[PDB]
From Swiss-Prot, chain A:
The gene is rpsZ. GO terms for biological process: translation. Binds 1 zinc ion per subunit. Zn(2+) binds at residues 23, 26, 39, 42. Belongs to the universal ribosomal protein uS14 family. Zinc-binding uS14 subfamily. This is Small ribosomal subunit protein uS14.
From Swiss-Prot, chain C:
This is Small ribosomal subunit protein uS7. One of its GO terms (cellular component) is small ribosomal subunit. Coiled coil: none annotated. Disulfide bonds: none annotated. CDD domains: uS7_Bacteria. Belongs to the universal ribosomal protein uS7 family. One of its GO terms (molecular function) is rRNA binding. The lineage of its organism: Bacteria, Thermotogati, Deinococcota, Deinococci, Thermales. PROSITE patterns: RIBOSOMAL_S7. One of the primary rRNA binding proteins, it binds directly to 3'-end of the 16S rRNA where it nucleates assembly of the head domain of the 30S subunit. Is located at the subunit interface close to the decoding center. Binds mRNA and the E site tRNA blocking its exit path in the ribosome. This blockage implies that this section of the ribosome must be able to move to release the deacetylated tRNA.
From Swiss-Prot, chain D:
Keywords: Ribonucleoprotein, Ribosomal protein, RNA-binding, rRNA-binding. This is Small ribosomal subunit protein uS3. It comes from the Bacteria. Residues 38-106 form the KH type-2 domain. InterPro entries: KH_dom, KH_dom-like_a/b, KH_dom_type_2, KH_sf_prok-type, Ribosomal_S3_C_sf, Ribosomal_uS3_bac-typ, Ribosomal_uS3_C, Ribosomal_uS3_CS. Part of the 30S ribosomal subunit. Forms a tight complex with proteins S10 and S14. Belongs to the universal ribosomal protein uS3 family.
UniProtKB/Swiss-Prot annotation, chain H:
It holds the Pfam family Ribosomal_S9. The keyword rRNA-binding applies. The gene is rpsI. GO terms for biological process: translation. This is Small ribosomal subunit protein uS9. Coiled coil: none annotated. Part of the 30S ribosomal subunit. Contacts proteins S7 and S10.
RNA sequence: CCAGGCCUUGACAUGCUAGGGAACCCGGGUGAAAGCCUGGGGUGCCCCGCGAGGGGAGCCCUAGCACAGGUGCUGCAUGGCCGUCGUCAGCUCGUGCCGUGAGGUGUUGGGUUAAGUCCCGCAACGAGCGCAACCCCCGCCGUUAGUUGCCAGCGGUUCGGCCGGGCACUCUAACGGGACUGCCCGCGAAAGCGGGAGGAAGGAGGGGACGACGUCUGGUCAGCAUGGCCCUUACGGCCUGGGCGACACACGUGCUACAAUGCCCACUACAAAGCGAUGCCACCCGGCAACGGGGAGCUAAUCGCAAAAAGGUGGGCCCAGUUCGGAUUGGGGUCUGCAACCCGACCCCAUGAAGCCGGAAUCGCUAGUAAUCGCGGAUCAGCCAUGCCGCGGUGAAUAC
């Protein structure tokens, strides 16, 4: 995540097809979840601390 | 159109773009995929028998 | 199996006849767990026996099995850095198992088109002491006393 | 690696979420982003205050950020000058008009997050790694604690081969889902590298 | 068997740039990256230079090659 | 018949509908 | 006919909150249908553990959004007194449509 | 008058109703045989009745929801069993030896990750 | 990443010295875009002696500066997190005792266990990390709860649980019960083992989550962070087009099939778990059709995705490279989207390849497993997903 692409991808583009997602936190973009807005790494790192409400550990 | 006439329309249809510098055309000359497949693996239907070449050691 | 002998699965008898030997047989025909089909195969395959043979298919079935259970077999063994075929007396469990399995592996090799038929016919030629289900039997035993030169090891 | 962040494993029987509220689908992602923004100031400005936790109760338009400090006589400031600032510097970010409560930390020695930090600063002051650790552990043991434990990342005293310093007393059953072991993590930045401090503190039972 | 529904696409970059070449008659060389565009009968006979990955291959247009696109005339892959 | 995109199971597989698998 | 829906993340937080609405409702209201679960909707999260590349790792995370309901037929201005501003939970949302 | 029993199996429930009658089975208003047409082991349902020579003394108003037709069988079967105690509790005497008041967790096992099913691990070639 | 065109206190932070301007907004020229040039309207808050105007805060440009920026090397400089031996049953400590000492004992031996699990014994007695247990799902049942559920019991039907009416059942979900080798027989010094019974369930009832001390200098500086060296008119920044999809080949994971225990068409029946606002789309209509026009319902136990498929009945096929198989190619369409040539999926007509069950060799799986069948979701305009992560339907064999 280069500052050049984080702050970049935020600006409104000339084509809406162009607008991709990035993690609000890490800057990763390979695979962020819409529901939270974070990278699959960041999702974890937080879920653990408990900083994402109602987000428990699955078990069945 | 059936045999006597189809096998003709297609044959020439192929030459159509062949005669022109048409990408799709080139694929026809090379005997590769045309509709957009990969040429690293599974494409044995357009090339046919496998032409095994040599490689190099690593051990 | 390393700690125990491992209990053998008890099956549910048949809804029609009630012999569990039946259930075992079908299970062996069943592919992709289509047990509803496998059942029909056996059934209509019995109907063929009534129309072509003047006997009760239940008993016929049994005599067929009874007649394929090979009573002698071979078991590979590395005795002195070599593959010596060691004949041995076969147990009741294995007999039953081998029979059904061959009745079907041979069956499906028949030149016949319909599957219910193919089975029906194997159950007949069986009793009479022929076909190929019984051939895979005599072929085995023909290896038993064939190398009975070696029956002097384990058991 | 093995292990599983103790906390994340316990929010179920005992240990609540660091931000408990509710949300839809359209607001969740947004809400949370603003949340994380909050800590991105508290952590910065409330360093020396001995921060610990940041509870966050949301509601309609109203919001409440309870901040646990070791040394509140700092967050507060002179008669109520800094806490005044922290609210305005706060609304500058969130257009939500939110309160900020402050709860003194009953014994900073029993608060894993803090404990970890304690070591950290000590490592930046070029202190003695091995010793720094041992003392740390006893501090927790003397007061209360049914079990303590401190770890370190690597490059103890700036060596050329990062190692790990192990140390603990009492019990620390990271396997007993009815423990209630706090776990802190520091991150000292030294001239030769980054080193990671980890606390673990066993408290009570059922 | 490819398709663009109802409304053939051509980039206004050269469209209105090529039509200004008919008022005068003919031209010689054109250069525009847009290869996205389908070829119109109104372009026939012109000598357009389309961009490769690095080069700018000129492409002469004929009556029989109108049903295609510019890109179909720019080979990108260098082989053998 | 899972690759014959012009049969019953053919669409079922790709999950599309056409002249061989309609909407009723 | 006050329809009361209670959506929340903690079933304890709802249970109580749904009890709080149930208690002072029979005190000043009339015949209450009690609290009823739905369903409850979950949001699974299958993420990989290591930030590197080990597909076979993967940690599982869930997010249950429980749903509760409390109906109150024959609504009196008295009932709407006790249940006007007598709440306590923080991670619970309510919506009424009558 | 009315004999309910409750019969659950493999995520499927079956409402069991035994009224004294001629002996017929109505499932969801449909002729028993018309519903279970082609089902070989279908007959299994009635095994518990034919257990106490009680074939044809009761009727069968049975419903069912969930599961699979070839699991709806065992489903009813159990059900019929449970209602039968109501009529005569001393019935276990012949029932349990046949084990019809048993219920096994034969449920479909959770799909584990990394794998391709419950156990089915993916194959490796050169190790 | 490559090409070509363009940019430099720079797309982003904090700030400094000099000079000019509220911010802002709306055009045009050149252009592939970015960028460059150019033009207009436009003139706020502060503080001052009325005015004129003067200094100032924020904001903008310009010139210089501190610095921004770097997916640029180094995972043998590091954090964190993960893979791994290994869910294996071990790894250790205090004190006591043994030994000049390194160390030993305990932890071992005999029995037992899934287990350093427990019994007996013994210079040891304990303890820690690990096993187990506490926690979640599944199976029985109880209480609390009734807009799911039903003639279960009564009254009407457009006979659709549709309506009333009713919570009983199904359910839904929150709490609690229930198995402990407790009972009986035999074996045993004990631990425990075998067998039986009552029970929904047995000896850890099925599955989860859960990985010790350490090992590999494991992996990862391209997630993040970070010591260090390296670039700063560029190793940076914007853009357009190309590339990551290249092909004589080779190997891995898989998908489709070689067919009659089958293929096709038709009519007909059981599922679960998920997701849905500009989103799921009922329903009508146009079209072979993908789709489109129209338009209701749902904010979702009350609407929708939806059809489950295999199965079941009828009928067609007749053993053919075939009504098996669907590759490739021609043709014509739909949709997404700025744009589908490179390089999208989908429909339809035609084409109908290899392939008739696989060399040496090699994988998985011990029960609702495998095998087989369909369904859902994440990501996502769309989609190259036959992948992944879950769901249930049916349902084996076999272990000396
Ligand atoms: Zn992130």
């Amino acid at each position: 995540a280069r500052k050049a692409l984080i702050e970049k991808a935020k600006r409104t583009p000339k084509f809406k097809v162009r607008a991709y997602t990035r993690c609000v936190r890490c800057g990763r973009a390979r695979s962020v979840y819409r529901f939270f807005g974070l990278c699959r790494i960041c999702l974890r790192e937080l879920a653990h601390k408990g900083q994402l409400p109602g987000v428990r550990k699955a078990s069945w | 159109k059936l045999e006597g006439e189809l096998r003709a329309e297609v044959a020439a249809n192929i030459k159509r773009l062949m005669d022109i510098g048409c990408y799709r055309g080139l694929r026809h000359r090379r005997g590769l995929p045309v509709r957009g497949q990969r040429t690293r693996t599974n494409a044995r239907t357009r090339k046919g028998p496998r032409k095994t070449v040599a490689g190099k050691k690593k051990a | 199996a390393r700690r125990r002998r491992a209990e053998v699965r008890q099956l549910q008898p048949d809804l029609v006849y009630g012999d569990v030997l039946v259930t075992a047989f079908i299970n062996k025909i069943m592919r992709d767990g289509k047990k509803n089909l496998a059942a029909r195969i056996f059934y209509d395959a019995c109907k063929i026996i009534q129309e072509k043979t003047g006997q009760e298919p239940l008993k016929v079935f049994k005599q067929a099995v009874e007649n394929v259970k090979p009573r002698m077999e071979v078991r590979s063994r590395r005795v002195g850095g070599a593959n010596y075929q060691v004949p041995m007396e076969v147990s009741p469990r294995r007999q039953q198992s081998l029979a059904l399995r061959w009745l079907v592996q041979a069956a499906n090799q028949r030149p016949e088109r319909r599957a219910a038929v193919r089975i029906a016919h194997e159950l007949m030629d069986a009793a009479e002491g022929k076909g190929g289900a019984v051939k895979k039997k005599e072929d085995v035993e023909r290896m038993a006393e064939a190398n009975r030169a070696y029956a002097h090891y384990r058991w | 690696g093995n292990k599983i962040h103790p906390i994340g494993f316990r929010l179920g029987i005992t240990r609540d979420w660091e931000s408990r509220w509710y949300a839809g689908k359209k607001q969740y992602r947004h809400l949370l982003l603003e949340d994380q923004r909050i800590r991105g100031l508290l952590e910065k400005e409330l360093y020396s205050a001995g921060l610990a936790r940041v509870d966050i109760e949301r509601a309609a338009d109203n919001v409440a950020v309870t901040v646990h400090v070791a040394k509140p006589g700092v967050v507060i400031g002179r008669g109520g000058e800094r806490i005044r600032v922290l609210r305005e510097e706060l609304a500058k970010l969130t257009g939500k008009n939110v309160a900020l409560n402050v709860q003194e930390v009953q014994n900073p020695n029993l608060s894993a997050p803090l404990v970890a930090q304690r070591v950290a600063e000590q490592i930046e002051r070029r202190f003695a790694v091995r010793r720094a650790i041992k003392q740390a552990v006893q501090r927790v043991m003397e007061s209360g604690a049914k079990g303590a434990k401190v770890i370190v990342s690597g490059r103890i005293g700036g060596a050329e081969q990062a190692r790990t310093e192990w140390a603990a007393q009492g019990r620390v059953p990271l396997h007993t889902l009815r423990a209630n072991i706090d776990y802190g993590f520091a991150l000292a930045r030294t001239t030769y590298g980054v080193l990671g401090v980890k606390a673990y503190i066993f408290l009570g039972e059922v | 068997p490819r398709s663009l529904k109802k409304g053939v696409f051509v980039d206004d970059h050269l469209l209105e740039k090529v039509l200004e070449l008919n008022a005068k008659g003919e031209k010689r060389l054109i250069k525009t990256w847009s290869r996205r565009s389908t070829i119109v009968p109104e372009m026939v006979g012109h000598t357009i230079a389309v961009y490769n990955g690095k080069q700018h291959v000129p492409v002469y247009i004929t009556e029989n090659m109108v049903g295609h696109k510019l890109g179909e005339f720019a080979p990108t892959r260098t082989y053998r | 018949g899972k690759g014959d995109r012009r049969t019953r199971r053919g669409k079922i597989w790709r999950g599309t509908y056409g002249k061989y698998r309609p909407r009723k | 006919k006050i329809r009361i829906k209670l959506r929340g993340f903690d079933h304890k937080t709802l249970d109580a909150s749904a009890q709080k609405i149930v208690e002072a409702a029979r005190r000043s209201g009339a015949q209450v249908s009690g609290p009823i679960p739905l369903p409850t909707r979950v949001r699974r999260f299958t993420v990989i553990r290591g930030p590197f590349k080990h597909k076979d790792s993967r940690e599982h995370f869930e997010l249950r959004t429980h749903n509760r309901l409390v109906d109150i037929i024959n609504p009196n201005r008295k009932t709407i007194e006790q249940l006007m501003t007598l709440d306590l939970p923080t991670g619970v949302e309510i919506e009424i449509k009558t | 008058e009315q004999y309910y029993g409750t019969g659950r199996r493999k995520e499927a429930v079956a409402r069991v109703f035994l009224r004294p009658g001629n002996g017929k089975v109505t499932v969801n208003g449909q002729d028993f045989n018309e519903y279970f047409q082609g089902l070989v082991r279908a007959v299994a349902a009635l095994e518990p009745l034919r257990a106490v020579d009680a074939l044809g003394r009761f009727d069968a108003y049975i419903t069912v929801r969930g599961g699979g037709k070839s699991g709806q069988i065992d489903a009813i079967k159990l059900g019929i069993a449970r209602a039968l105690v109501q009529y005569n509790p001393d019935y276990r005497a012949k029932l349990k030896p046949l084990g019809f008041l048993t219920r096994d967790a034969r449920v479909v096992e959770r799909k584990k990750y990394g794998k391709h099913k419950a156990r089915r691990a993916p194959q490796y070639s050169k190790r």
